[PDB]
Amino acid sequence: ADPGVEGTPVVGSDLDDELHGTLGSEQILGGGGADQLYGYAGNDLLDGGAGRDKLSGGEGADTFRFALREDSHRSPLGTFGDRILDFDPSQDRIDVSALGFSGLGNGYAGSLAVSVSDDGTRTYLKSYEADAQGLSFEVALEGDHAAALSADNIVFAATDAAAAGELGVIGASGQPDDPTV
Numbered sequence: 124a125d126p127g128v129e130g131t132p133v134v135g136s137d138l139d140d141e142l143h144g145t146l147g148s149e150q151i152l153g154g155g156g157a158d159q160l161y162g163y164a165g166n167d168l169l170d171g172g173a174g175r176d177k178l179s180g181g182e183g184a185d186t187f188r189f190a191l192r193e194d195s196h197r198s199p200l201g202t203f204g205d206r207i208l209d210f211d212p213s214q215d216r217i218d219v220s221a222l223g224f225s226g227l228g229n230g231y232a233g234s235l236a237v238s239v240s241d242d243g244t245r246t247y248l249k250s251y252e253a254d255a256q257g258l259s260f261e262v263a264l265e266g267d268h269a270a271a272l273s274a275d276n277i278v279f280a281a282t283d284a285a286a287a288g289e290l291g292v293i294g295a296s297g298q299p300d301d302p303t304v
């Protein structure tokens with residue numbers, strides 16, 4: 124075995140990249156260009172920067188923090204929402220407080236309302252808060268686990284875990300039939 128990492132933010136910040144990271148914890152920043160970022164194993168921190176970025180968190184509890192208000196957002200000019208390949212909605216988290224919103228919008232089961240492209244292709248998650256300038260937050264996911272997304276893994280509560288976990292999904296009811304045929 125021989126290390127010699129070609130990834131990490133050390134190279135290609137302002138232009139399109141292919142960064143393959145280590146099997147340990149890292150801070151990954153894409154910078155400019157449509158980057159292909161791969162965090163792999165370890166608890167990683169990931170920012171995309173300018174452009175529509177394609178990114179994997181990999182194994183470990185990852186933090187998709189993003190750079191500024193100008194990252195993973197939509198504006199009247201067009202969308203710049205990033206494209207996450209393998210987000211784990213149980214283990215990983217996505218920050219949005221400094222860049223998008225602090226109060227979650229419309230949604231149910233402790234979530235934000237999800238969207239799909241069609242029968243296939245990517246799924247999306249949207250925030251329904253926007254700036255008066257039309258700067259809103261949306262992000263695309265191609266793992267198609269929209270059915271498991273929750274606002275619990277969307278971190279706007281300053282990473283404080285004193286609250287949350289409030290669910291009322293539990294329950295049972297029925298209308299039984301009694302045929303004799």
Ligand SMILES: [Ca+2]
Binds near residue numbers: 136140
């Ligand atoms: Ca780059």
Ligand SMILES: [Ca+2]
Binds near residue numbers: 155158172
């Ligand atoms: Ca980028």
Ligand SMILES: [Ca+2]
Binds near residue numbers: 165
């Ligand atoms: Ca890593």
Ligand SMILES: [Ca+2]
Binds near residue numbers: 175204
């Ligand atoms: Ca980006």
Ligand SMILES: [Ca+2]
Binds near residue numbers: 162166184185
């Ligand atoms: Ca990882």
Ligand SMILES: [Ca+2]
Binds near residue numbers: 183215
């Ligand atoms: Ca992960």
